[PDB]
Structure formats: structure tokens, C-alpha cells
Design a protein around this ligand. Structure first.
Ligand code: ZN
Ligand code: ZN
Lengths: 507, 507
């Protein structure tokens, strides 16, 4: 039946706030998402390559300007937006005697903020102000992670208790206000963060992980239908799409044929080397074809002298994404691969065999992307990642990136089991650069092509890569005593890109 | 069931094109919509008032710069966008042996383009190029209108024949691809254009109007569920919202309380005078409260020395619209009032008594906006529009705008019947400024407050107001022979704002 507008229902005020919160994970603001996800996460995670020759100072070359590296902490579109809206939702939940919106808001808060600590290490968190003021004492990263678990646990408790209630759908382009899906996502995120800390605090990691997958707490994401995917662009412009297409070559400058590969960002060589080697049917779903003769898929190397787009850059495979594409937060495949690693590498009780979880992860990913042939792929014990023959001949890498094969081997050593899991988890997490970067730092997988053009002045290792972002210069201006205290006490290393964050403590 | 992305379905290419077409009626581009609908249609239609004191050259004061008046013809977001996408849809329909998308596209084309001729009079139309090139011979407005009817008729024929088919829903935020709704809208638009020409060609008008409401052709919009409303902003920013809020006063500059009335555009005095007088329960739905003591609703006068927003402008009632609000094209109320006028004023066979259509229009409008009290309103034969006592004391108008009462009087003279119909039609069409402006030019109703600050140098009459926009200056540069020919032969008057367009020929 026809329903009149009612700006007054508010209802309306709530919707604005909840949608604003969701925008704090991956920003709908193009320039913000460009920094956090196209220029930081994508390249550092082995997915994307910078492809504007004018970008002479980059994160991927390890000489970023403050204005590139700082964004997660300094963008008013992130922390101030998150906290201001949190404050409003908390008040709505109180006023309406309905705890559901604030509970979901707390899940979104962790989804947004773990990305921030994962980038810098110690950050302001527990003491952040009502309006997202970060001119406060820092938490150690360990304390931050502890707080994340507490917040998720509280949210999960509230949602479970209100499992029959709902959020108005117009307030939620992830799950349309479905409380049970939010519970699954919250537990899934809890699992992500548990495996993150598996080296740093194995006791806590095991406890959190086993709680996450325990039916008594409402379960994890086990189906693509339940992916944490932000479908907020059906009537506008996906920011990764816009940002990757910035400066794309015009048809009239491309022989009268459109160029489909994008502009400022292309697909990375690394992921394409693996997927080409593996004859992976997901390729056509992830990437645009290259314009290089006889090669359907070839990525641009990360950490090079970036070529001119107009001459050669435009020929490399691009990111296969549309204006109406959603933004991913977390998928079912990742949950399966977390359980696989939990069991195989850390001997956690994940609810099934590691082999079963690994295979299911791959099946979930093929299903997610509509790719056929998963059953033959799963059993492939022959095909290996390729080396990187640059069609331009400038940036060739002579070595196969790894010799790791797809088929599960239950008699493999832990190190090999971990590599296999992370390689497939990484493929499945295409576009979630920040997550890939975190996993690479924690595990050392996948093995990537080392940086060639390392602009760090010897500070950053070409293989180990960027371990973190340096602290924003403004911290030393507006928050000096507090950032200095964090450097001295919580960072456990110099304030530069070579220092590992706390959870990155694998032997 | 879970469905994978498939950018390849195209399917996808079609969706982009169809959504692009819809954007050519009222643009989602904020600055474009600001010009066509906030600064042109809204004020000229008696709905909105310009409220930036820096706007010293305006359409509403009758001294517009070329860059304000030209937009409908010169914006690349309108004609070039429309035609380029039309060309693509035509090819898709051919290639897929499916005529439905092009048929709907033709309805959108007329919806977009009638606004353009209605603004200027003679325009390029029949000869416009594949890419929306307007450097071509002009049509007379009569020829343009003839072409509109032919195009609508062809569309309606195709849709009727394919009444059981569908358009993919992601291609259509008006009707979700429902072919029968599109038929109703097409006939409704045909009726709008038929009544438009009721003075200029009564023979044709009657024929088109009676065809439009004939069941054999599939019917008109008779329910709010079937409104031509573009619900394209649930996840972004309605352009009328953004544009009306430009320069809104900041809370810290407003005594620590938010200001809710907007910035660059406020609600007009005229509509509020009628609605206050009529004790109209739709007021709270249309407008924000004013900040003037003891007065819930008071609009800003149009065509004045525009005051400073910060001092007094911000106190006037604003437009009650949200970021997620849709954009209206045509509603059920309008159809009812077209039928009312058709029967009462022109003796067309509309399918019912004029009284019944008038009352139904008012009922539809109350229902549309969720307003109670329509039954008592309908029977009100006492309450009259007010005069305009400016709370600021600067721009007071001492006369009641009209003495016309709400209740239908079937023994009234045609002139009174027309006024009553148009006044209620005008109220019901809140936000559709261009349409109100057209009706005012054709009928002389509603009676408005005459312009006080008339910046036209004596060219434009303060009561009759702007009769058209002058031709864009670029026409004399890129299309000289053709625009001059149109002035000499088709315009039937000087190229200025005082000359009536062809359909505006009431005695
Ligand atoms: Zn190209
Ligand atoms: Zn105010």
C-alpha cells in the first residue's frame, strides 16, 4: 500500500545516523576511499597497483607524503563521522528503549576502527571523545584489541537477546535490519580479530575464536547470502570504481576504441601471476582483460617507476568493478579460511576438519563470483603460480612467486598448510586490501613480488614491505605528549614504516 | 537465492543508460537541478524564493545572467546526456529484439524535453543529433508538441502490445520495470500536454485528452501507488535538498540551536498565504516551521531585495525535504485536476463530473502527503487566502492574493471554476515549479503576489512575470542562422522574457 513521506518519523534521524556509520568502514567519499583502499590497502595487500606516472610519492613505493599516509586517523570522514553518529545512536537507543540500533552500531564501530589500529599500531581508542576527538592518550594495540572483543561481546549479547526484533531496513544496506545476520557478522569479525592475535596472545585467541564459532553464541557467516556487503551504490557511484577510473584514457586518445582498464589504479601483477598459473576461472570476474597481445590477464607491478598511462599503463588489466558495485566488508569464504587456519595451524576447535574448511572457502568464493569449475580446481595438485614477464619488458621478475599448489595436503608441514590457506584466502578477498595487508604482515603470505623501486631511503625492506604507516605529522602538533608516550612505550620500535605492530609477532 | 555480480550481463549497459535517461528530467547533479528547478521553476511557479543576498542577478527578479537562464538548452547534463543514452537504448532494443526499453525511453524523452520547450518556446527538437547536438534548425513549438504526441502514441502502442513483458527493475527507480505503470504515466503525460494546448489548438487538445483517458489505451494514473516519482536517492543526496540547503546558517551562528529552514532557497510567501488562509493540514508536510514569533508558516516573498540569510532570511519557512527524498515528475492529483479542467472549462469527455475530479484531486493530494482532514477541507466555503504581512516589515503586500474558496461550486462561471481547479492543482504540485510556471502562463492562475523588485528595465511585467527564458547567448555563436530564423518566424515576438510561448494564447 501507498505510504506517505514522514520526515518526522525519525525513524528518519536514526536512518541517517546508521547509514553514516556504515560509511566509516570504506568511505563512500571517493577521495577518502582512494586513500584508504585504493592507494594504501590495495597495493600493500598485493591486489592493486598505482598507475599514475605523476604519483612520484606513494605508499606503495614507501615514500608517502603525510597527506596520503595519515588519512585513517586524520580524515574527518572517518573517526569524527563515526563517533558523532555513535553518540546520536546511543541516545536514540536510550530514548526509544530499543537497544538494537546501538548494538549494530557497535559492530560497525569495530569494523571501522580495527582498520585504523591495523594501519598504525597504537592509537587513541578507549579515550576518544564524543565527537571523535583523538587528542587523547593512546591505547596499546593489545588494549585496543581487548576493547574490540569486549564491544563485540556486548553487541552479540544484546542482539541475541533481541534476535526476534529488527532494525528499520532503510537504516541498513548490509542486512536490511536483519538482527540474526548482524549476529553472524559480529561473530565472524570476532573470529577475524581472534586469528589476528593468534601469535601475540594465543590463549585469548583460542578462547575468542572458539566462542565465535560456538552455536550457543549464534554462529558465523556460512553462506554468501549472509556476506557483509554494503549494497549502497545501486543509484550512485561506488568510490573504488570512481577512484580506479580517475584519469582513464579517453576513447579519442585510444584509437577510437574505449579503454576499459581504468586510470589511477590497475590490477596488481602479483594476484594475476597466481591466478594465471592456477588457470583460475575467477579471473574474468576480478579483472578486465589486458590490451597486451596474446595475454588476457597481466597486472602492473607494485613499487616500480610508474609508467605513463597513455603509453603503456593503460594496457595492463584493470579492476573489474562498476559504478553500482557494492563495497565488501567480509565474506563467507574468509570465515571458512579462518576456521581452516585456526584448526590446521593453531589447533583450535573450529567445528570441522581443516581440509573441509579450506575446500569450502574455495567453493564459497567461486559461488560468490559465479565462476564454474571449482571441483577440478580444488583437486589441482599440478599448476603453480607464474613468474612475471612484463610485456613492456621494463619490470620483469624472473622467479615464480611460489611453488605452492592448490590441492589440500593434510600431511604437509604447518608452514605449507598456512601458505596454502592464506593464498586462497587472499584470492577470495580480492578488493579487501587492508585485510590482505594485515594477513601478509602476520603470516608472511602470500609470497609476493618484492618492491623494485624502493623510495624509503633504506628504511623499509623490499620484501617485508610497509609494516605500518608512520604517525600523522599533526599528532606532534595537537597531541604531542600522547603520541610521544606511545612511541616510547607502546610502539616498541621507531615511528616509521619498518616497525611491526603488536599482533605482527610471528617467529 | 544468492546471485553473483555479472557486469557482463549488460543488462548492465542497459541499466546505466536507462538510469541516465531518468536523470534528464530533474537532474541528480545538484548544480544543474539548482538552476532548472530551484532558481527557475520554483520561483516562477510560486513555490520557492531565492534567499542568498549575494544573488543580485536572478531569474525571479527578471535580470538573470546567461549562465542561469540557459541551462535547459546548454547543460551537457541534459540534452547531450539524453540523446546519447537514447541512441544506445535504441540500439539495445534492436539488438535484443525487445522494444520495451526504447518505448520507456521515449516516454522519458518527452518528460525531459517538454520542460525545455516550455521554458524557451521554439527549440531544436525534431532535428537534434544522435549525440544531442542542438546546432540545427529549430521547430516551431507547435511542431514540437505534435512530435511529442506522436512519440507518446508510438510508445503507448509498443508498451500495450508488450503489456505482459517487463524491464529489469535495476533500470527503473520510477516503476521497477512495470510496463503497465509506464503506460499509465505515458497517457497521463499525454493528458498534461493536451490540456497545455487547449487554447492553441482546441481540436487537437480534445482528441489527445479523450484518447488519454480512454480505457482502450490503457488508462491514466489514478492512484498514488502509481505516481511518476523517481526514488533514486535512498542511498545518496536529493539535489533539491542539497541545493536548498546550500549556505544554511551554522548552529554555532544560530544561538547554539540548529537552523532547519535551509539556505539559498526558502518556501515562497505565495503558497503559504493560500495554505494558511485555507487552514491546510498539508502545511507541516510541505514546509519547515518559520522562526518568526507566533507564526508557524511564513514564506519569503519572490522578486524582492533579497535580505541577508544570517540576519532575517533564515527565519522564513523552508522546503520540507530530506537527502533521501525522491524527485517528483507527475502525480495522481494532477491527473484528476487535468480531468476536472478538461470537463469544466473545455467540455471534454473526461469520464466523470468535474466536481468529482476536483474533489478526488484534493483527496489524492492529502493521501499522498499523509495529511488528515480532507473531508472538512473539501467542504470549506468560508476560508480564503491571506494577505502577506512580512514579519520583517520590509516586503509586506496588503491585499489578499485571491478570495477564491475551496468548495466546488458547479454554478460558478468558467473563470472561477478554472481558478479553483488551478489553485488546488498548484498546491498539490508543490516542488514541480516548472509545471506550476507553465499553468500560470497558460491560465493566469493562481493569482500571485506581484514582483516588487523588478530588475528587467521595464521589459517584464511585475504581474504577468517571466513568459519565457531568453535564448542562450551561445545560440548566436554556434547556431546563428537557425536561432535568428526562429526569432523571425516561430517566436512571434522579441527574444526576451516578455514574449509568450505558442501555447500561452488564452484571451
Ligand atoms: Zn587502453
Ligand atoms: Zn534559523
Amino acid at each position: 500500500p501507498y505510504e506517505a513521506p514522514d520526515l518526522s518519523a525519525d525513524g528518519y534521524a536514526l536512518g541517517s545516523a546508521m547509514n553514516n556509520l556504515a560509511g566509516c568502514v570504506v568511505s563512500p567519499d571517493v577521495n577518502t576511499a582512494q586513500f584508504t583502499d585504493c592507494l594504501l590497502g590495495g597495493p600493500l595487500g598485493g591486489y592493486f597497483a598505482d598507475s599514475n606516472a605523476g604519483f612520484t610519492e606513494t605508499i606503495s613505493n614507501f615514500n608517502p607524503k603525510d597527506d596520503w599516509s595519515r588519512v585513517f586517523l586524520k580524515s574527518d570522514k572517518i573517526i569524527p563521522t563515526l563517533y558523532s553518529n555513535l553518540t546520536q545512536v546511543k541516545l536514540v537507543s536510550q530514548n526509544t528503549n530499543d537497544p538494537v540500533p546501538y548494538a549494530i552500531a557497535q559492530v560497525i564501530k569495530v569494523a571501522a576502527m580495527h582498520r585504523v589500529t591495523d594501519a598504525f599500531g597504537p592509537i587513541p581508542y578507549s579515550q576518544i571523545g564524543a565527537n571523535g576527538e583523538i587528542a587523547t592518550p593512546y591505547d596499546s594495540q593489545e588494549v585496543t584489541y581487548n576493547t574490540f572483543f569486549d564491544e563485540l561481546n556486548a553487541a552479540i549479547a544484546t542482539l541475541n537477546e533481541n534476535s526476534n526484533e529488527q532494525l528499520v531496513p532503510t537504516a541498513d544496506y548490509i542486512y536490511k535490519g536483519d538482527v540474526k545476520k548482524w549476529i553472524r557478522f559480529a561473530n565472524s569479525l570476532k573470529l577475524r580479530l581472534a586469528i589476528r592475535i593468534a601469535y601475540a596472545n594465543p590463549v585469548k585467541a583460542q578462547q575468542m575464536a572458539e566462542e565465535a564459532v560456538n552455536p550457543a553464541n549464534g554462529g558465523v557467516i556460512e553462506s554468501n547470502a549472509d556476506n557483509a556487503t554494503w549494497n549502497y551504490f545501486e543509484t550512485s557511484q561506488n568510490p573504488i570504481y570512481v577512484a580506479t577510473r580517475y584519469n582513464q584514457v579517453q576513447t579519442s586518445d585510444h584509437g577510437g576504441v574505449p579503454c576499459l582498464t581504468g586510470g589511477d589504479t590497475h590490477a596488481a601483477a602479483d594476484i594475476i601471476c597466481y591466478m594465471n598459473g592456477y588457470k583460475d576461472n575467477r579471473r574474468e570476474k576480478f579483472f578486465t582483460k589486458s590490451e597486451w597481445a596474446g595475454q588476457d590477464y597481466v597486472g602492473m607491478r607494485r613499487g616500480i617507476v610508474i609508467p605513463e598511462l597513455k603509453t603503456t599503463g593503460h594496457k595492463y588489466s584493470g579492476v573489474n568493478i562498476a559504478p553500482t558495485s557494492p563495497l565488501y566488508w567480509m565474506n563467507a569464504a574468509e570465515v571458512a579460511f579462518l576456521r581452516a587456519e585456526g584448526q590446521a595451524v593453531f589447533n583450535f576447535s573450529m567445528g570441522g576438519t581443516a581440509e573441509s574448511f579450506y575446500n569450502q572457502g574455495i567453493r564459497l568464493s567461486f559461488e560468490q563470483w559465479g565462476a564454474d569449475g571449482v571441483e577440478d580446481y580444488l583437486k589441482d595438485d599440478v599448476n603453480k603460480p607464474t613468474a612475471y614477464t612484463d610485456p613492456a619488458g621494463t619490470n620483469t621478475y624472473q622467479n615464480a612467486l611460489s611453488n605452492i599448489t592448490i590441492k589440500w595436503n593434510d600431511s604437509a608441514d604447518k608452514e605449507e598448510k598456512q601458505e596454502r590457506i592464506i593464498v586462497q584466502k587472499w584470492i577470495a578477498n580480492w578488493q579487501l586490501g587492508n585485510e590482505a595487508w594485515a594477513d601478509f604482515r602476520r603470516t608472511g603470505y602470500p609470497k609476493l613480488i618484492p618492491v623494485k623501486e624502493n623510495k624509503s631511503g633504506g628504511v623499509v625492506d623490499s620484501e617485508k614491505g610497509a609494516r605500518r604507516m608512520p604517525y600523522p605529522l599533526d599528532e606532534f602538533v595537537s597531541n604531542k605528549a600522547n603520541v610521544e608516550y606511545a612511541i616510547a612505550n607502546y610502539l616498541h620500535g621507531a615511528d616509521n614504516m619498518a616497525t611491526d605492530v603488536w599482533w605482527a609477532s610471528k617467529k
